[PDB]
RNA sequence: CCAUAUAUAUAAUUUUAAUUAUAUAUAAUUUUAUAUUAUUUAUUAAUAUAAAGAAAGGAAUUAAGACAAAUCAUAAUGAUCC
């Protein structure tokens, strides 16, 4: 009997990668006519099955390009061959019983927990009036901003409960929590809120 | 006539010259300065140009040669050296 | 015992001619038995060659050997080694076997 | 480049290796290359006739012909 | 046939995928009606329907552009005997010599494949991968088209020693036997090397010379004939001529393989 | 590994700060679709626009030279001295 190298690309730099790309090209070539229209294995994961140390990032990008081209084929016209080949490389909030959306936000060392219900724009902070708790107009406007982004100011009642940090931190925590609570009532507005900058935590904090 | 260089260690330009395009803000400023020089400062004639500058610099005040690479890549093909 | 899946210790696993023959059969397909039995080596040149370098002078050992089966096959091999002369002789034997 | 000897005489080198005992198994190509000898002449060949127009090269008309 | 496809209702119009399948059905049946095309060159066929060595004529070699040699200013004078003449500033290759050398090289490839040897198709120019891969697949051989690593033959342990190897029967059937580490780490050397661009692959030619690997190549007007065992005078810079010659050699190898299998099945 | 965002567990919500505490686990080096300009011209960068995004920061972790030391209080051993 005869000992021969397994792969047709044995004398290339990275025979495993070349052979795998050859199979992918063969499938992409047989079914070139099919029209078109979920992460893949990582670089180390493909290194294990390919060239290992010989694997190169350009080779990995080529693999991903072919895999994305094959996957992007229209699902209704795909078949068992393409899916079988590709399989080798594959790696809700609601209101409570009282109709309230509960959210928790943070800013600096301040934390806020807000109950947002449908109402007429009334707001309480720590059981106190907004103007009594927040003397600074800027903080009040910061709390208002997410409500007025979705133009729903005057349509919800807010019960905010803060602790930690100072005035501005508590106010902006109320802001972020109010945004997160508002997303529940109408998920379609989330992107709008997300584009206003009120749905992203301000990760900035005091550093040594 | 054609001049043929000897087999050279390299084919490279010492100082590749690139065509940076003069900033629009600078030329608009120059035009405004010439306007106020001729008609006068805050003259009615060229005041419109001022508006453009007020916009053009509003966001920011001011708003690459591959010859050596290609020469090095292609030299072995085009040098026309004798065979061996 | 706690042996790994494959040990490689020929005495504890739980010369020039032999290593030359094995490496040559591994790298080029030459027969080990022919090398070990039939070929004979005599070192022709053995010297020390030096190279200057900014940090210091570096010494290396150069060996030139000739191998042959005395029946019409002869080869010349040269070997360099900074570490030891024996390794230079080993490399020279390797090259001479390759140049038969 | 000089006319290269080693490229076309691979069969002879392999035969020496095999008969000496340095190589034990004949390569698969040995019998084929033995059956089909490589061309081992690299000679500049004279040309006496231009095929395109038939002009004959290498002819001198002697004095007697005129 | 076409799983995971949801047809449309009769009341509604065709979908995009239904239109695609409808047009495919039209194409496979009626689009080819009206005439049959004859005596027209289709490039893909040069890879998939190569002619046998005995059926090759000088006209067929000239149609592929095999005769068109390098510029007269880049002449390698050692290739004088292969040249028919010069025309329009380039040297013309003598296609009768090309036919003889090509038939000889095809016989060499057929013999090597019939003996079960390893055939390596090396060509590193831009668009040569398709023909190289098809030749290797139909000859049960191997190919390289990205780059020839220097030392692939003379330093095989440090280059190709890590890749896996395989025991196979006389009928090229996998045996799935477990190979010992020493067997896996041996050099596996090509029995025949064919080079499409020998001018840009001097390293491979020199390694084959050192390792005693007989080699075939397409020898253009500027290439050295004596660096290879079995030269093929022809144009190496045109993809059509290269693919024609490669297809001829690959068909010879396939014929040798088929003869081997036929004898093993009797 | 921190920090951040989430999930599970734990707490008979009087050790109450459940907005909390600390264990395990996940997540990102962000992913994409186009437009323009450059491009080794695409299976590329600069931006900008749109979409899914909580995702925006940080520390540590190796050797080779060369200089400086006796509050070298960053020590040991030795030399000498009472
Ligand atoms: Mg050429």
Chain C residues near residue E189 by CB distance under 8 angstroms = 29
Cβ neighbourhood burial of D24 (10 Å; 0-12, 13-18, 19+): middle
Tell me which chain C residue has its CA closest to the CA of residue E213. C28
Question: Contact, A164 vs A196, CB < 8 A?
Answer: no
Whole-number Cα distances in Å, A110 to A101, A106, E175: 20, 6, 70
> Which nucleotide does the CA of A64 lie closest to, via C1'?
F43
Whole-number Cα distances in Å, E44 to A65, E128, E133, E235, E236: 25, 12, 13, 19, 18
Element of type H or E holding A175: helix A167-185
Question: Contact, E218 vs E232, CB < 8 A?
Answer: yes
Q: Is the CB of B12 under 7 A from strand F?
A: no
What is the rounded CA–CA span in Å between residue A62 and residue A52?
A: 16
Question: Contact, E226 vs E78, CB < 8 A?
Answer: yes
Q: In the structure, how far is the CA atom of residue A198 from the C1' atom of nucleotide F55, in angstroms?
A: 14
What is the rounded CA–CA span in Å between residue E80 and residue E28?
A: 52
Cβ distance of E229 and D7 shorter than 8 Å: yes
B4-32: buried (b, 16+ CB within 10 Å) or exposed (e) per residue? eeeeeeebeeeeeeeeeeeeeeeebeeeb
Question: Residue E128: helix, strand or coil by DSSP?
Answer: coil
DSSP A68-132: HHHHTB-GGG--HHHHHHHHTTB------TTS-EEEEEEETTEEEEEEEEESSS-EEETTEEHHH
Backbone angles phi, psi at B23, to 5 degrees: -60, 140
Q: How far is A88 from chain E (nearest CA, A)?
A: 20
Q: Token match 């039209």: residue?
A: E26
**Helices A15-30 and A80-87 meet at what angle, rounded to 10?**
160
What is the rounded CA–CA span in Å between residue E174 and residue A41?
A: 29
Nearest to C78 by CA among C60, C96, C61: C96
Breaks in chain C (C–N beyond 2.5 Å) sit after 14
Question: Contact, E143 vs D59, CB < 8 A?
Answer: no
Element of type H or E holding C61: strand C57-68
Cβ distance of E222 and B83 shorter than 8 Å: yes
How many residues in total does chain A contain?
208
Q: Is the CB of A43 under 7 A from strand F?
A: yes
Cβ neighbourhood burial of E208 (10 Å; 0-12, 13-18, 19+): buried
Query: A123-125 and C40-52 as β-strands: parallel, antiparallel, unpaired?
Result: unpaired
> Which nucleotide does the CA of A163 lie closest to, via C1'?
F19
Chain Cα centroid distance, residue B74: 26
What is the rounded CA–CA span in Å between residue C52 and residue C48?
A: 13
Whole-number Cα distances in Å, E14 to A79, A132, E18, E22: 21, 66, 6, 9
Sequence-distant (≥ 6) Cβ neighbours of residue E88 within 8 angstroms: none
Residue E209 neighbours by CB distance under 10 Å = 22
Q: In the structure, how far is the CA atom of residue A93 from the C1' atom of nucleotide F25, in angstroms?
A: 21
What is the rounded CA–CA span in Å between residue E20 and residue E10?
A: 17
Query: Which token pair is A122?
Result: 């009334």
CA of A200 to the centre of ligand 1 (A): 62
What is the rounded CA–CA span in Å between residue E229 and residue A12?
A: 23
Q: Is the CB of A125 under 7 A from strand F?
A: no
What is the rounded CA–CA span in Å between residue E220 and residue E93?
A: 8
What is the rounded CA–CA span in Å between residue E69 and residue E90?
A: 6
Residue E225 neighbours by CB distance under 10 Å = 24
Cα angle E39, E42, E46 (rounded to 5 degrees) comes to: 105
What is the rounded CA–CA span in Å between residue A163 and residue A173?
A: 10
Residue C36 neighbours by CB distance under 10 Å = 14
E-assigned strand segments in chain E:
68-71, 83-87, 90-93, 119-122, 142-144, 165-168, 192-195, 215-219, 230-233
What is the rounded CA–CA span in Å between residue E52 and residue E255?
A: 9
E4 touches chain A (CB under 8 A): yes
Query: Which token pair is E112?
Result: 């090597």
What is the rounded CA–CA span in Å between residue B79 and residue D61?
A: 45
Nearest to A4 among E2, E152, E166 (CB): E166
Query: Which token pair is E171?
Result: 């009928």
Q: Is the CB of A176 under 7 A from strand F?
A: no
The residues placing their C-beta within 5 Å of ligand 1, an ion, are E 220, 236-237
What is the rounded CA–CA span in Å between residue E121 and residue E142?
A: 6
Cβ neighbourhood burial of A46 (10 Å; 0-12, 13-18, 19+): buried
Measuring alpha carbon to C1', the residue closest to nucleotide F52 is A191
Q: Is the CB of A56 under 7 A from strand F?
A: no
Element of type H or E holding C65: strand C57-68
Q: Is the CB of A163 under 7 A from strand F?
A: yes
Sequence-distant (≥ 6) Cβ neighbours of residue C11 within 8 angstroms: none
Nearest to C99 by CA among E148, E212, D34, D2: E212
SS3 content of chain B, % helix, strand, coil (to 5): 45, 0, 55
Question: Contact, E186 vs C26, CB < 8 A?
Answer: yes
What is the rounded CA–CA span in Å between residue E247 and residue E243?
A: 6
Sequence-distant (≥ 6) Cβ neighbours of residue A54 within 8 angstroms: A13, A14, A17
Query: Which token pair is E252?
Result: 């010879």
Tell me which chain D residue has its CA closest to the CA of residue C71. D20
Beta bridge partners of E192: E119
Question: Contact, E21 vs E2, CB < 8 A?
Answer: yes
Cβ distance of C30 and D21 shorter than 8 Å: no
Long-range contacts of B39-46 (CB under 8 A, 24+ apart): none
């Amino acid at each position: 009997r005869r000992i021969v190298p397994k792969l047709a690309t044995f004398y290339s730099a990275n025979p495993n990668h070349e052979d795998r790309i050859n199979r992918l090209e063969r499938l992409l070539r047989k079914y070139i006519k099919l029209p078109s229209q979920a992460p893949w294995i990582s670089f180390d994961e493909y290194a294990l099955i390919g060239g290992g140390t010989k694997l190169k990032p350009t080779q990995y990008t080529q693999l991903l390009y072919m895999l994305n081209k094959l996957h992007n084929i229209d699902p209704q016209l795909t078949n068992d061959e393409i899916t079988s080949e590709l399989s080798q490389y594959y790696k809700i909030k609601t209101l409570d019983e009282f109709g309230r959306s509960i959210a928790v936000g943070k800013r600096k060392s301040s934390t806020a927990k807000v109950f947002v219900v449908r109402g007429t724009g009334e707001i309480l902070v720590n059981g106190r009036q907004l103007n009594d708790y927040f003397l600074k107009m800027k903080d009040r406007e910061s709390i208002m901003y997410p409500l007025q982004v979705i133009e729903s100011v005057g349509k919800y009642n807010i019960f905010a409960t803060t602790s930690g940090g100072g005035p501005t931190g508590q106010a902006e925590s109320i802001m972020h929590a109010i945004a997160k609570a508002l997303v529940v009532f109408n998920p379609l507005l989330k992107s709008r809120l997300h584009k206003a900058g009120v749905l992203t935590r301000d990760y900035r904090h005091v550093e040594r | 006539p054609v001049y043929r260089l000897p087999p050279l260690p390299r084919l490279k330009v010492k100082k590749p010259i690139i065509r940076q395009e003069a900033n629009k803000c600078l030329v608009l400023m120059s035009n405004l300065l010439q306007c106020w020089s001729s008609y006068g400062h805050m003259s009615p004639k060229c005041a419109g140009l001022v508006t453009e500058l007020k916009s053009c610099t509003s966001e920011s005040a001011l708003g690459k040669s591959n010859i050596n690479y290609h020469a090095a890549r292609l030299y072995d093909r085009i040098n026309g050296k004798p065979h061996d | 015992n706690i042996l790994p899946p494959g040990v490689s210790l020929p005495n504890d696993g739980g010369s020039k001619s032999a290593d030359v023959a094995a490496g040559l059969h591994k790298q080029t397909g030459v027969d080990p038995d022919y090398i070990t039995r039939k070929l004979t080596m005599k070192p022709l040149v053995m010297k020390r060659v030096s190279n200057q370098t900014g940090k210091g002078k570096i010494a290396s050992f150069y060996a030139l050997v000739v191998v042959g089966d005395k029946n019409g096959m002869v080869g010349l091999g040269e070997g360099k080694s900074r570490e030891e002369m024996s390794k230079a002789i080993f490399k020279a034997h390797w090259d001479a076997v390759r140049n038969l | 480049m000089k006319i290269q000897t080693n490229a076309v005489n691979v069969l002879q080198r392999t035969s020496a290796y095999l008969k000496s005992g340095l190589l034990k198994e004949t390569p698969a190509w040995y019998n084929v290359v033995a059956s089909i000898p490589p061309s081992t002449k690299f000679t500049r060949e004279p040309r006496f006739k231009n095929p395109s127009n038939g002009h004959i090269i290498g002819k001198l008309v002697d004095v007697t012909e005129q | 046939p076409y799983p995971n496809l949801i047809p449309s209702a009769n009341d509604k119009p065709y979908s995009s995928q239904e239109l695609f399948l409808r047009q495919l059905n039209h194409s496979m049946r009626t689009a080819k009606l009206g005439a049959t095309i004859s005596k027209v060159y289709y490039p893909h066929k040069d890879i998939f329907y190569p002619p046998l060595p005995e059926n090759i004529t000088v006209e067929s070699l000239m149609s592929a552009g095999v005769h068109l040699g390098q510029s007269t200013s880049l002449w390698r004078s050692s290739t004088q005997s292969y040249i028919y003449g010069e025309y329009k500033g380039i040297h013309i290759i003598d296609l009768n010599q090309t036919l003889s050398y090509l038939k000889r090289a095809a016989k060499v490839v057929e013999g090597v494949s019939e003996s079960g040897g390893i055939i390596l198709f090396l060509g590193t120019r831009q668009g040569q991968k398709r023909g190289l891969e098809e030749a290797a697949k139909k000859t049960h051989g191997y190919y390289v088209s990205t780059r020839w690593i220097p030392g692939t033959l003379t330093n095989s342990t440090e280059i190709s020693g890590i890749w896996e190897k395989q025991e196979i029967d006389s009928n090229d059937n996998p045996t799935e036997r477990a190979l010992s580490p020493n067997e896996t780490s041996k050099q596996v050397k090509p029995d025949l090397l064919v080079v499409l661009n020998p001018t840009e692959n001097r390293n491979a030619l020199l390694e084959a010379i050192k390792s005693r690997v007989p080699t075939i190549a397409i020898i253009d007007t500027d290439s050295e004939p004596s660096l290879v065992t079995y030269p093929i005078p022809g144009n190496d810079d045109s993809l059509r001529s290269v693919n024609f010659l490669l297809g001829v050699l690959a068909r010879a190898g396939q014929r040798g393989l088929q003869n081997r299998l036929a004898r093993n099945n009797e």
